[PDB]
Design a protein around this ligand. Structure first.
Ligand SMILES: Nc1ncnc2c1ncn2[C@@H]1O[C@H](COP(=O)(O)OP(=O)(O)OP(=O)(O)O)[C@@H](O)[C@H]1O
Ligand SMILES: [Mg+2]
Lengths: 596, 158, 79, 79
């Protein structure tokens, strides 16, 4: 039979309380209905409806051979479709369904098996055996169908979801598509794949500790296609079938998980052992993909070399950030951006924050400064680590806490799938902070505007003020890197820069401190664009026409580029051509002289 | 053309917040102040400029050159046509009164120089004549109501 | 009925009789041929969502002043 | 899809229509129903092929009888 180690594994997995049950036809085989009998199978129901339709056609007076050939039709789908398409009295078909699928009383094994704590209930039945079994056992239930939005029932518990419909409040017109009985209903464009509950089902079977199938015959092909491909899901699922079944009879089921041929009767006893432990279990677990940011506890001395490293070479520690945060008078060590206060005020009112910027204009450092200040204000800030561990489990464990949480994601275009899940299944006490470049934002506009972005505040950190220019030149004055230019006044110093490059941190850094870090970043982005000879010739032609000063025209650019790649629409969708030349309506213009 | 501009502007100006924000953009471009998101929030008397769906509208994209999320005007000959013909004078004077009251109301605490120069720049007759061209009644009503919105203007010879 | 609970439905089910419970957010023409209409005038608890406390379930002093009531519903003529 | 959109008629020769995907293609539309012809075996009652009748016209004559129609129509098709 079934071994003892499988018993121990099943007990341990079900005792967590994060298990999922899939209910099939075999669970409610022992229940009784309105007419005082066990609910029928497809064969008897098909025979009854064929007999009904044949009696009607006998009443209307057709030939006897047609009647004798329709009566013996025991295919539920074809008989139901013929009834709904030819016989005009569908009210009695609905009445027959209501008579046959309304459970009046349940047994005790069902009460014991449905007195646990599950994550969610999924079923393919029509009857109300599960809802009755949940009330009787001292617990609420709210049933649903595929025609219900899952976002309205986000906070609800004891969600018993019926997939092929329900008869409790079914109407007359629901037989065509809603209740999967006929061949016409299975071919409809409205199916389980197109429904919004499909994504929820996938997330649930990804997140659960174990999945238990109760007497499921695995008829539906979509669930087969879900469960066949993966192997990590197979190591968690279990199947319960009736007694006296050989391995070859369960070979079809064995491809999707372990098979235990004991029946619901034997699983009820395991439920009786595990019910008390199911409701108690609680564990905070560990968070693997998000590291908890912690503020500084000691005072470190800041030396000029640290100023030089942070200003030019890009290297800084979080102790430096925590030190410049606590005292706001220390303008000689960091630039105080005015957007931090606006961003904090926005985040105190339950609003998400999306920051977009150009190349290297102080975005990750702003994220770190925000992280340092918001923990001091009393939140909990978690920084997303680019790890191979799961993200749905971590966001679930974060939701299980009871504090105010802010989650920081940097350069979300590289983790667009996780960042999507984050905006898809966000909770009440979790805010989001997403930062990205302009190209990364514009390449994912169509993946994000379809969701709810009304709770998002969009900020841009591309430009500064004249006060921040004065602060930057004060930092350089304290560093003393001007050289021979220290004698001249403020206007003379920045006289060699263009108007818009003057109000950007990246060009200011490259022009004054000649930050190699920015040079390395520019080389990295431009390498992937200048690898092709054609694009290299076109970029050099654009630069040549700009340094001459003569205006840019597609014919002229093609003439001096010795090719015709400017006419192609893919030239303006490259990396460097977008990140080094500002584009507008397909035209190409350069940013500033200090870059070219 | 006028028909094309009317058709493409009615696709955005039908909303109240969109109309207020577009009027704020045109007003601040008329005065000459920089088009900053936080300041256009105060002038527009809402926070629809922070939403990501504003810059993807038909009217906003088709009347203003957008670039990396920022909003700037196309040309003066279209902005002044919009002010004269698409926005009615009766809407313009009422919205001007509303924003003049609100700026002062929120500026009594923050004490920002930009709001002060905005208020003392709206009172100049050149901007008002550039906003309500040859309208005697609306100009008179605006000038006779600004002194009752804020009571310190009577002591100012300006 | 005016109760928000399921005693009528459990009583009907336990007596060998089916039931289709509804509310005022259902149209009468879709259930023209239906039998055992247990219409809940005040509201229902069985599958109430979070937004049903404002107007759907008549409990608060705001849910008695909403523009949607028993008079303006389509079930008034049927009653 | 484009081929069944542009064609004059679609002929099925002894196709039991087991795959669900062609079923989902042909069940929805009505203009494609008028151009579809199913050729099944002889000695079949109407019911035995009710499943195939939902998608288009069904003729129970077999390839045996269709050979004569092909032989009578070959000389016109190339012209
Ligand atoms: N608040 C600040 N004060 C002073 N210097 C800053 C500040 N923010 C950024 N910098 C300087 O700018 C450099 C680049 O900034 P940062 O690495 O944060 O860019 P980024 O926009 O996050 O980058 P990328 O867009 O490439 O991901 C830093 O090495 C630092 O010298
Ligand atoms: Mg960064």
């Amino acid at each position: 039979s079934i071994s003892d180690e499988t018993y121990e594994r099943l007990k341990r997995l079900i005792s967590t309380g994060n298990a999922i049950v899939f209910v099939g036809a075999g669970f409610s085989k022992e229940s009784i209905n309105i007419i005082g009998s066990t609910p029928p199978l497809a064969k008897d129901l098909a025979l009854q409806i064929s007999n009904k339709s044949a009696n009607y056609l006998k009443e209307v007076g057709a030939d006897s051979h047609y009647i004798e050939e329709i009566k013996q039709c025991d295919d539920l789908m074809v008989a139901s479709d013929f009834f709904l398409n030819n016989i005009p009295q569908k009210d009695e078909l609905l009445q027959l369904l209501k008579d046959n699928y309304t459970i009046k009383d349940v047994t005790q094994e069902q009460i014991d098996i449905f007195s646990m704590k599950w994550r969610r209930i999924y079923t393919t039945n029509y009857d109300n055996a599960i809802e009755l079994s949940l009330i009787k056992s001292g617990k609420s239930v709210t049933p649903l169908t595929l025609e219900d939005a899952p976002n309205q029932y986000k906070s609800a518990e004891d969600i018993c979801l019926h997939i092929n419909g329900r008869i409790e409040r079914s109407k007359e017109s629901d037989l065509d598509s809603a209740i999967k009985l006929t061949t016409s209903s299975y071919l409809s464009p409205e199916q389980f794949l197109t429904s919004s509950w499909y994504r929820q089902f996938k997330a649930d079977i990804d997140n659960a500790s174990a999945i238990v199938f109760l007497g499921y015959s695995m008829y539906d092909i979509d669930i087969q296609k879900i469960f066949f491909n993966d192997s990590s899901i197979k190591s968690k699922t279990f199947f319960i079938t009736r007694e006296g079944t050989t391995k070859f009879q369960n070979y079809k089921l064995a491809m999707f998980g372990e098979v235990i041929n004991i029946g619901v009767n034997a699983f009820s006893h395991i439920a009786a052992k595990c019910i008390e432990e199911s409701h108690q279990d609680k564990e905070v677990g560990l968070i693997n993909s998000l590291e908890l940011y912690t503020p500084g506890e000691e005072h470190d001395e800041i030396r000029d070399n640290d100023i030089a490293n942070f200003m030019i070479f890009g290297k800084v520690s979080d102790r430096y950030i925590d030190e410049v945060t606590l005292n706001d008078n220390m303008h000689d060590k960091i630039i105080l951006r005015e957007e931090v206060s606006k961003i904090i005020e926005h985040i105190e009112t339950d609003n998400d924050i999306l920051i977009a910027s150009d190349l290297g204009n102080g975005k990750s450092i702003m994220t770190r400064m925000l992280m340092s200040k918001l923990s001091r204000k009393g939140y909990l800030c978690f920084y997303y680590l680019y790890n191979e561990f799961s993200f749905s489990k971590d966001i679930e464990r974060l939701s299980k806490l009871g504090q105010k949480i802010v989650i920081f994601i940097d350069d979300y275009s590289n983790c667009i799938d996780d960042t999507r899940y984050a905006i898809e299944n966000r909770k009440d006490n979790i805010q989001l902070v997403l930062t990205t470049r302009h190209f990364g934002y514009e390449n994912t506009k169509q993946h994000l505007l379809t969701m709810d972005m009304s709770s998002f505040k969009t900020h841009s950190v591309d430009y500064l003020s004249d006060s921040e220019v004065d602060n930057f030149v004060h930092i350089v004055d304290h560093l003393g890197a001007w050289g021979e230019k220290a004698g001249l006044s403020r206007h003379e110093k920045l006289s060699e820069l263009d108007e818009n490059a003057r109000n950007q941190l990246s060009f200011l850094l490259l022009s004054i401190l000649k930050s190699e870090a920015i040079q390395s970043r520019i080389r990295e982005i431009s390498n992937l664009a200048l690898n092709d000879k054609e694009y290299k010739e076109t970029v050099f032609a654009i630069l040549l026409l700009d340094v001459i000063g003569l205006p840019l025209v597609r014919s002229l650019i093609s003439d001096v580029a010795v090719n015709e790649k400017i006419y192609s629409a893919e030239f303006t969708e490259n990396e460097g051509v977008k990140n080094l030349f500002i584009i507008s309506n397909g035209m190409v213009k350069t940013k500033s002289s200090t870059l070219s | 053309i006028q028909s094309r501009i009317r058709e493409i502007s009615n696709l955005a100006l039908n909303d109240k917040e969109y109309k207020e924000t577009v009027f704020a953009i045109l007003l601040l471009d008329v005065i000459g102040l920089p088009l900053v998101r936080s300041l256009i929030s105060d002038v527009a008397v809402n926070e629809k400029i922070y939403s990501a769906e504003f810059t993807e509208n038909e009217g906003v994209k088709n009347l203003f050159i957008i670039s990396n999320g920022m909003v700037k005007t196309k040309s003066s000959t279209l902005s002044r046509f919009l002010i004269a013909n698409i926005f009615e004078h009766k809407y313009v004077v009422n919205q001007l009164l509303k924003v003049i009251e609100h700026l002062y109301v929120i500026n009594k605490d923050a004490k920002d120089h930009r709001l002060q120069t905005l208020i003392t720049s709206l009172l100049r007759f050149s901007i008002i004549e550039k906003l309500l061209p040859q309208r005697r009644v609306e100009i008179n009503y605006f000038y006779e109501k600004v002194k009752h919105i804020i009571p310190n203007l009577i002591n100012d010879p300006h």
